[PDB]
Each structure stands twice: as structure tokens, then as C-alpha cells.
CSV table of C-alpha atoms and ligand atoms in Angstrom, one decimal:
chain,number,residue,atom,x,y,z
A,1,UNK,CA,38.3,2.1,14.7
A,2,UNK,CA,36.6,0.8,17.8
A,3,UNK,CA,35.3,3.0,20.7
A,4,UNK,CA,37.6,3.2,23.7
A,5,UNK,CA,36.1,1.8,26.9
A,6,UNK,CA,36.7,3.3,30.4
A,7,UNK,CA,39.1,0.4,30.9
A,8,UNK,CA,41.0,1.3,27.7
A,9,UNK,CA,41.3,4.9,28.9
A,10,UNK,CA,42.5,3.9,32.4
A,11,UNK,CA,45.3,1.9,30.7
A,12,UNK,CA,46.2,4.7,28.3
A,13,UNK,CA,46.6,7.1,31.2
A,14,UNK,CA,49.2,5.0,33.0
A,15,UNK,CA,50.9,4.2,29.6
A,16,UNK,CA,51.2,7.9,28.8
A,17,UNK,CA,52.3,8.8,32.3
A,18,UNK,CA,55.0,6.0,32.2
A,19,UNK,CA,56.1,6.7,28.6
A,20,UNK,CA,56.3,10.5,29.0
A,21,UNK,CA,57.6,10.3,32.6
A,22,UNK,CA,54.8,12.6,33.8
A,23,UNK,CA,55.6,13.8,37.4
A,24,UNK,CA,53.3,12.8,40.2
A,25,UNK,CA,51.9,16.3,40.8
A,26,UNK,CA,50.6,16.4,37.2
A,27,UNK,CA,48.9,13.0,37.6
A,28,UNK,CA,47.1,14.5,40.6
A,29,UNK,CA,45.9,17.4,38.6
A,30,UNK,CA,44.7,15.3,35.6
A,31,UNK,CA,42.7,13.2,38.1
A,32,UNK,CA,40.8,16.4,39.1
A,33,UNK,CA,40.3,17.5,35.5
A,34,UNK,CA,43.0,20.3,35.9
A,35,UNK,CA,45.1,20.6,32.8
A,36,UNK,CA,47.9,23.2,33.0
A,37,UNK,CA,48.8,25.3,30.0
A,38,UNK,CA,52.2,23.8,29.5
A,39,UNK,CA,53.9,21.4,27.1
A,40,UNK,CA,54.0,18.6,29.7
A,41,UNK,CA,50.2,18.6,29.8
A,42,UNK,CA,49.6,19.2,26.0
A,43,UNK,CA,51.9,16.3,25.0
A,44,UNK,CA,50.0,14.1,27.6
A,45,UNK,CA,46.7,14.9,26.1
A,46,UNK,CA,48.1,14.3,22.6
A,47,UNK,CA,49.4,10.9,23.8
A,48,UNK,CA,46.0,9.9,25.2
A,49,UNK,CA,44.2,11.0,22.0
A,50,UNK,CA,46.8,9.1,19.9
A,51,UNK,CA,46.1,5.9,21.8
A,52,UNK,CA,42.3,6.4,21.6
A,53,UNK,CA,42.7,7.0,17.8
A,54,UNK,CA,41.1,10.4,18.2
A,55,UNK,CA,44.0,12.4,16.9
A,56,UNK,CA,46.9,11.9,14.4
A,57,UNK,CA,50.0,14.1,14.6
A,58,UNK,CA,49.9,14.8,10.9
A,59,UNK,CA,46.2,14.6,10.0
A,60,UNK,CA,45.0,16.1,13.2
A,61,UNK,CA,41.6,15.3,14.8
A,62,UNK,CA,40.0,12.2,13.5
A,63,UNK,CA,36.5,13.4,13.1
A,64,UNK,CA,34.4,10.3,12.5
A,65,UNK,CA,36.3,8.5,15.3
A,66,UNK,CA,35.5,11.4,17.7
A,67,UNK,CA,31.8,11.3,16.8
A,68,UNK,CA,31.5,7.6,17.6
A,69,UNK,CA,33.5,8.2,20.9
A,70,UNK,CA,31.2,11.1,21.9
A,71,UNK,CA,27.7,10.5,20.4
A,72,UNK,CA,26.5,7.7,22.7
A,73,UNK,CA,22.9,8.6,23.5
A,74,UNK,CA,23.1,11.7,21.3
A,75,UNK,CA,22.4,12.6,17.7
A,76,UNK,CA,25.6,11.7,15.7
A,77,UNK,CA,25.2,14.6,13.2
A,78,UNK,CA,24.6,17.2,16.0
A,79,UNK,CA,27.8,15.9,17.6
A,80,UNK,CA,29.7,15.9,14.3
A,81,UNK,CA,28.7,19.6,13.9
A,82,UNK,CA,30.1,20.4,17.3
A,83,UNK,CA,33.4,18.4,16.6
A,84,UNK,CA,33.9,20.2,13.3
A,85,UNK,CA,33.7,23.6,15.0
A,86,UNK,CA,36.8,22.6,16.9
A,87,UNK,CA,38.7,21.1,14.0
A,88,UNK,CA,41.4,23.5,12.8
A,89,UNK,CA,44.7,23.5,10.9
A,90,UNK,CA,48.1,22.8,12.6
A,91,UNK,CA,48.7,26.6,12.6
A,92,UNK,CA,51.8,26.6,14.9
A,93,UNK,CA,53.4,23.4,13.6
A,94,UNK,CA,53.1,21.6,17.0
A,95,UNK,CA,51.0,18.3,17.3
A,96,UNK,CA,50.9,18.7,21.2
A,97,UNK,CA,49.5,22.3,20.9
A,98,UNK,CA,47.2,21.1,18.2
A,99,UNK,CA,45.6,18.2,20.1
A,100,UNK,CA,45.3,20.3,23.3
A,101,UNK,CA,43.7,23.2,21.4
A,102,UNK,CA,40.9,21.0,20.0
A,103,UNK,CA,40.4,19.5,23.6
A,104,UNK,CA,40.1,23.1,25.0
A,105,UNK,CA,37.7,24.1,22.2
A,106,UNK,CA,35.4,21.1,22.7
A,107,UNK,CA,35.3,21.5,26.5
A,108,UNK,CA,33.9,25.0,26.2
A,109,UNK,CA,30.4,24.0,25.2
A,110,UNK,CA,30.5,20.1,25.3
A,111,UNK,CA,32.2,19.3,28.6
A,112,UNK,CA,29.4,17.0,29.9
A,113,UNK,CA,29.6,15.1,26.6
A,114,UNK,CA,33.3,14.5,27.2
A,115,UNK,CA,32.8,13.4,30.8
A,116,UNK,CA,29.9,11.1,29.8
A,117,UNK,CA,32.0,9.4,27.1
A,118,UNK,CA,34.6,8.2,29.7
A,119,UNK,CA,32.2,6.6,32.2
A,120,UNK,CA,31.4,2.9,32.2
A,121,UNK,CA,28.5,2.0,30.0
B,201,EIC,C1,38.2,18.6,17.3
B,201,EIC,C2,38.6,18.4,18.8
B,201,EIC,C3,37.8,17.5,19.5
B,201,EIC,C4,38.2,17.3,21.0
B,201,EIC,C5,37.3,16.4,21.7
B,201,EIC,C6,37.6,16.2,23.2
B,201,EIC,C7,37.8,15.0,23.8
B,201,EIC,C8,37.8,13.7,23.2
B,201,EIC,C9,36.8,12.7,23.7
B,201,EIC,C10,37.0,11.8,24.7
B,201,EIC,C11,38.3,11.5,25.3
B,201,EIC,C12,38.4,11.9,26.8
B,201,EIC,C13,39.6,12.8,27.2
B,201,EIC,C14,40.3,12.3,28.4
B,201,EIC,C15,41.0,13.3,29.2
B,201,EIC,C16,42.5,12.9,29.4
B,201,EIC,C17,43.0,13.3,30.7
B,201,EIC,C18,42.7,12.3,31.8
B,201,EIC,O1,41.5,12.0,32.1
B,201,EIC,O2,43.7,11.7,32.4
B,202,CO,CO1,28.7,5.7,26.9
């Protein structure tokens, strides 16, 4: 694993939009950090996390990878504790739902951590 840069993420966005044929109105929403509760959006988030090596469709969230991605300027073990709170089983047998659910969980108390991780260092 190697941490994804801002440039890496910008590429992964356009790749997922192209590969999944995401409509233009969704792209606009994503830009404004608006993620509708629908399968279009959930599969998009899964696609991005796949490319960033933060999520595997079978194994689920890749915890150590997430910690490295998120713990810049923070305590790694504190961040690991927060990540693990959001790690769950693939209850409803849907990788798209699964990836999105962890995303939603982590945003609740760690939004600024997410946003900080995707800005140029
Ligand atoms: C256990 C679950 C953990 C979930 C952690 C959440 C986020 C992962 C960390 C960094 C990746 C940034 C997400 C980019 C958002 C995609 C939408 C977009 O900007 O186009
Ligand atoms: Co950083």
C-alpha cells in the first residue's frame, strides 16, 4: 500500500465517473460533498475506495491502509480506534452498501479527518 495523493484521488474520481457512467448531475453533487442514498452513489464510493486500496469487496474495509490514509498529523492508534468503530460485517451481502455504510459511519465524528486527508500536503 502507498497513501493516495490528491492527484491520485482526482484521477480516481474521473475514472469511476467514466467507468460507471455516472450522470453529470451526480458529479456536481459529489463535488459539493453531497452523496445521495442510492446505488449509483454507493457503487461510486465503493469504486473510489477500491482504487485507493481502502476497501475490498470481499474483505471489506482495509483497516491499516485507512489508518495511514487518515492519520497524517494525528495519533495512528487513536485513528485506528475510530476506524474500527466503523468496521462491520457485510450484513446485507452488497459491497456497494458496505463501502458506503463505513463512509457514512466515519463521517459522523471524523468528517474533518476525511477532508484533511484529501487536501494537498
Ligand atoms: C471503516 C470505514 C472507514 C471509512 C473512512 C472514510 C473515508 C476514507 C478516507 C479517505 C478517502 C476520501 C473519500 C473521498 C470521497 C469520494 C467522493 C469525491 O470526493 O468525489
Ligand atoms: Co495530509
